[PDB]
Symmetry: C2
Subunit: 389 residues, 2 copies
């Protein structure tokens, strides 16, 4: 009977998890829930699963919720603030912790779950891009079990050998017959748009923020950074590959030539159920992949001239977490600029490049250091945007 | 240091195995070689790996070998006959046994390696088609580790979860989150030939025997029977899927929706190196899969009207090992008739059907019972071919 704490229970990943806990009440139980300001959906969840605790971003949302729960007669104790969350991630009787809260708001709570040696269902890939060294070091000491929920990373994990799975982040690929890890990506919507046509591409053509990252492939570059930390992989053990149909979520290449891959519907309940029942399986309610109703599957090598963000990310890794933390921040600024129609589509990569170019510093050593680089990065970015508008 | 006995060392798999032992002399050592009448290649292998023993089918070949080894001054002791083969398979200090001797000649040698609790690299699929029950029962008792080498079964094995890999044949798919096994096949050369045209197809159009089994898909049907035994799979946990390019060797479907598959080049050294190194890996010298130099990957369900042999094999499974053993025997006769231009391509499935229909009996209970049905089946078959020629 696995008892958990969900960090970010109101967003989509948070609800999908609850979907799995719903149809598998014999395997899971929710002890605590942590959300931001959506008191509404929280009450709903506090009434269904009735955990022991519930945490909100502030006292306002907490007082409001507390009251609504009073009316329904929910025994659920309500708390608020960042510390509360971390205390929920570290709860003594909690087995697994779904880290679904993204952004800086998720760092401490996730790190706390790690330092307590809990099984971590990592649904906030972001963190490894900024706190890669810290988190991975903290895993080593506490021996916490990281379990990537992200679709591509969930697939790489399902394709790795057992001894590497039970010692994620601090295991030798090489020594276990792993030659390299194959990170796959659709290639974005401008995959075939002739080069001298990217500058004219508009937001409507790229169709929220991820779409853009998919278009520039900054998204794959970030997953590139996350992978190297998560699986302790060198640049020579990584492969980025374009796969448009996206049936194959990602693959792993072995010494004897075998390649292992994970396929399935795009539904997030599959990779979410996988990590929750590991090393076993449960029903996620996801539709069985129909191999007869699929687009032919194809592959192609990414072109750096078409995807400058991939190169930048790969270079930023060799430059340190200061560079990755800054590459991430700046990107959120330029992308946003692109959507508000303040820069050309092609300026995303150019401005993300400048920020880094014009940014000296030193490797962080803790969350606060990371937040500091993030702050400067955005600044230098906002300033760069203006320099073009 | 793994020491092995290779059964059928002169054929293709035999040489491929030796290729893997050759470039991994720190992991593998050959203790005994067993071949048929190819003295020539046997001598060459005995001089390279210099095993302790060497067995040949008869004394004539053994005498000639004993002599040629003398000249080169080979310490290799030469033996003859089937019993010797079995003694080599059960050799006390032998860790793995490559069962690569196909046909009836391989049953006892393999069975002997099994009764001794050896790790068995099963390279002759016929076994499970005729002696499925016996072999799998023997595995339970002696706790022998079966490790399928056949490309497709090897693919399924790498895609299964660890607790099932270490208890093959006697593990519950269901209890381990496995929904079903996806057996893949090219679909043959007549995959797209209109139905009313299969009767006119010739041996040249089908391009040895496997080509034909591939064309009629009897080959997948046999692999279907082998899978059910090897993985303790029911009819509802099986899926036959056509995949023309054959990059995906075979897959496995899980409860949470995930599908794991193995992909690679058609080179047998990959699956052979896999089994030999399991649960670890080694280099096999096989070229790394180049995802950028592949044909689009497609899938389609098999149509029983185009591939009658598939249905027959599935039906023959529910009828018993007498029927699978008979189906296998009859098929070798008819296919041979087809090549010799005695029957239409379309008479393969027709005569294979007739035989089983005109054949009553009872489930075997030992290698001798199986050999008996195999003998009758052939006969009832040779007689059917004649009825048409």
């Amino acid at each position: 009977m696995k008892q958990l704490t969900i960090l970010g229970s109101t967003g989509s990943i948070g609800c999908s998890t609850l979907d799995v806990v719903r149809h598998n009440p014999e395997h899971f139980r929710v002890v605590a829930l942590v959300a931001g300001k959506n008191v509404t959906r929280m009450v709903e969840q506090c009434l269904e699963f009735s955990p022991r605790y519930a945490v909100m971003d502030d006292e306002a949302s907490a007082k409001l919720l507390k009251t609504m729960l009073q009316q329904q007669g929910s025994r659920t104790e309500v708390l608020s603030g960042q510390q509360a969350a971390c205390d929920m991630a570290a709860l003594e009787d909690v087995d697994q912790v779904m880290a679904a809260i993204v952004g800086a708001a998720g760092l401490l709570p996730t790190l706390a779950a790690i330092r307590a040696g809990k099984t971590i269902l990592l649904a906030n890939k972001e963190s490894l891009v900024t706190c890669g060294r810290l988190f991975m070091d903290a895993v080593k000491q506490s021996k916490a079990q990281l379990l990537p929920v992200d679709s591509e990373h969930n697939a790489i994990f399902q394709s790795l050998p057992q001894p590497i799975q039970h010692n994620l982040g601090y295991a030798d690929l090489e020594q276990n017959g792993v030659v390299s890890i194959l990170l796959t990506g659709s290639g974005g919507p401008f995959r075939e748009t002739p080069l001298r046509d990217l500058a004219t591409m508009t937001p409507d053509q790229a169709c929220r923020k991820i779409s853009v990252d998919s278009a520039t492939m900054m998204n794959k570059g970030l997953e590139y950074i996350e992978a190297r930390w998560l699986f302790n992989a060198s640049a020579s053990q990584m492969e980025v590959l374009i796969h448009p149909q996206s049936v194959i979520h990602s693959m792993v290449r072995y010494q004897d030539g075998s390649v292992l891959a994970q396929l399935g519907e795009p539904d997030m309940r599959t990779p979410i159920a996988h990590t929750m029942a590991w090393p076993n399986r449960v029903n996620s309610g996801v539709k069985p992949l129909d191999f007869c109703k699929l687009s032919a599957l194809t592959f192609a090598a990414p072109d750096y001239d078409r995807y400058p963000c991939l190169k930048l990310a790969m270079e930023a890794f060799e430059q340190g977490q200061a560079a990755t933390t800054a590459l991430n921040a700046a990107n959120e600024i330029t992308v946003a600029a692109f959507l508000a129609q303040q820069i050309r589509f092609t300026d995303i990569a150019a401005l993300n490049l400048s920020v880094l170019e014009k940014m000296d510093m030193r490797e962080p050593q803790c969350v606060d250091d990371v937040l500091s680089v993030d702050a400067n990065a955005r600044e230098v970015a906002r300033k760069e945007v203006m320099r073009l508008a």
